[PDB]
Ligand binder design. Structure first.
Ligand SMILES: Cc1cc2nc3c(=O)[nH]c(=O)nc-3n(C[C@H](O)[C@H](O)[C@H](O)COP(=O)(O)OP(=O)(O)OC[C@H]3O[C@@H](n4cnc5c(N)ncnc54)[C@H](O)[C@@H]3O)c2cc1C
Ligand SMILES: O=c1nc2n(C[C@@H](O)[C@H](O)[C@@H](O)CO)c3cc(O)ccc3cc-2c(=O)[nH]1
Ligand SMILES: [Cl-]
Ligand SMILES: [Cl-]
Ligand SMILES: [Cl-]
Length: 419
């Protein structure tokens, strides 16, 4: 009887504890379940996930192995596959999310064989006992990456079942699959890493790796990435690994503070008088604010499914601080546009950019959207690609009065934080 390897947000063969744990015991068959709880999302994200599942199947086939893909609720389909295959047990990487725990609990109940869950590779795990709200103390627990696990060589023969739907992303996807991811990683470490510290705050994000869409789906292990960067070493290297660690900090935060999906981490802000306003929400959402930087960011996001960190923090903070828009709606609309959209990481980013309690980032830091563009888009090349409407970073009939909006937020936030 084979062992089932159930891939979720780990669509790869390299550094995959569940895959190896299973293969060491006997023949394996891989499984992906196309779960409506994750797939009732935007076309771009459905297609990014589907095409990486397709790539993983190709990877299994190229090694002579079998990847099943079934559609439906995991607690129906996983036991289905285990019965049809006569599997002895199912292996998967632990998910520490509320839905991960719910789903895996229901799967374990419905399976008449063990579900063996192994820790996913991390730089630091999300579920350490100590809760940290601040990145520095959390980051000090990291002492360098453990070595990643090899991929299998050839995989054991088995029967393949199930179809992988072809869906329209509506935009150009990156090349899916771990072969493309690993090529991307090795090029970045070679060419860009040396100046990463000096170039990671560009509005165009061209100093960075552009690997988040692979990290989000586990197509690339963060442990392997951290290990490879550390073997490279030099100055870029420490700073880039620090950013990998921000990803793990985000999982840590949502794990210890699950209620931050509902309300600010900082309790002083839980009564902030946000101002719902359909028109303003839409102006922001569609990048029609009259603020060049913000409009460029949101138009790039709509068209591509990616945005640099420096653009994300400007676009997100503008909504929260300059527009006073309810953050939850904005957060969710933002995640749905992102190929790398990842609930914990996006929540972290929004609560950080919004001055809502992450990393004790102070309320009083308010981006000046013309200075931000001046500092992070040299000859204005980025503004020109994405909103050439605008001759400069100067706001052009902005949907709000920018200085008043600034003064208004700071007044409100000064009352709240210091009262
Ligand atoms: C408002 C806001 C929302 C965000 N939403 C998401 C999201 O849903 N999914 C997502 O993957 N990232 C999100 N980010 C984090 C970050 O901006 C992206 O991961 C980054 O832009 C990816 O570009 P890159 O791969 O070139 O990063 P690099 O600079 O090359 O960094 C390497 C990797 O480290 C991680 N990383 C880098 N910066 C951060 C960060 N600020 N926080 C957490 N991890 C980080 C990512 O996994 C990234 O691929 C958000 C940031 C903000 C401020
Ligand atoms: O196991 C799945 N994971 C999917 N995930 C990956 C996870 O959400 C996965 O369940 C883990 O994130 C939790 O173990 C997706 C992620 C996206 O960004 C977009 C689409 C999906 C779709 C699925 C899916 O159908 N099945
Ligand atoms: Cl979603
Ligand atoms: Cl177990
Ligand atoms: Cl190891």
């Amino acid at each position: 009887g084979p062992l089932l390897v159930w891939h979720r947000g780990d669509l790869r063969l390299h550094d995959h504890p569940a895959l190896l744990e299973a293969l060491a015991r006997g023949p394996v068959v891989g499984l992906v379940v196309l779960d409506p709880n994750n797939l009732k999302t935007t076309p771009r994200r459905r297609a990014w996930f589907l095409e990486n599942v397709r790539a993983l199947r190709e990877a299994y086939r190229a090694r002579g192995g079998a990847l099943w893909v079934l559609e439906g609720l995991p607690w129906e389909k996983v036991p289905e596959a285990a019965r049809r295959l006569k599997a002895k047990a199912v292996y998967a990487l632990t998910s520490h999310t509320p839905y991960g725990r719910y789903r895996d609990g229901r799967v374990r109940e419905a399976l008449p064989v063990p579900l063996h869950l192994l820790p996913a590779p991390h730089l630091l795990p999300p579920d350490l006992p100590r809760a940290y709200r601040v990145y520095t103390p959390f980051s000090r627990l990291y002492r360098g990456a453990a070595p990643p696990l090899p991929p299998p060589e050839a995989l054991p023969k088995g029967p393949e079942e199930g179809e992988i739907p072809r869906e329209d992303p509506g935009l150009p996807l990156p090349e899916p699959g771990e072969e493309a991811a690993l090529a991307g990683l090795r090029a970045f470490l070679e060419a860009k890493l040396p100046r990463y510290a000096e170039e990671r705050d560009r509005l165009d994000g061209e100093g960075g790796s552009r690997l988040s869409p692979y990290f989000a789906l586990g197509v690339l292990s963060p442990r392997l990435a951290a290990w490879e960067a550390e073997r490279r070493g030099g100055e870029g290297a420490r700073k880039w690994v620090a950013e990998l660690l921000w990803r793990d900090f985000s999982y840590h935060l949502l794990y210890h503070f699950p209620w931050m999906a509902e309300r600010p981490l900082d309790p002083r802000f839980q009564a902030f008088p946000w101002q719902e306003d359909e028109a303003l929400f839409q102006a922001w959402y569609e990048g029609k604010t009259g603020v060049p930087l913000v409009d460029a960011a949101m138009r790039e996001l709509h068209a591509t499914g990616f945005l640099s960190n420096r653009a994300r923090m400007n676009a997100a903070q503008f909504a929260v601080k300059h527009l006073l828009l309810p953050w939850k709606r904005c957060e969710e609309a933002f995640r749905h546009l992102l190929l790398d959209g990842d609930r914990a990481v996006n929540l972290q980013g929004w609560q950080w950019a919004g001055g809502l309690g992450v990393d004790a980032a102070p309320y009083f830091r308010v981006f000046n959207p013309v200075l931000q563009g001046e500092r992070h888009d040299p000859e204005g090349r980025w503004l020109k690609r994405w909103a050439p409407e605008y001759p400069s970073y100067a706001p052009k009939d902005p949907v709000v009065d920018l200085e008043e909006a600034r003064r208004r937020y700071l007044r409100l936030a000064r009352d709240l934080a210091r009262g």
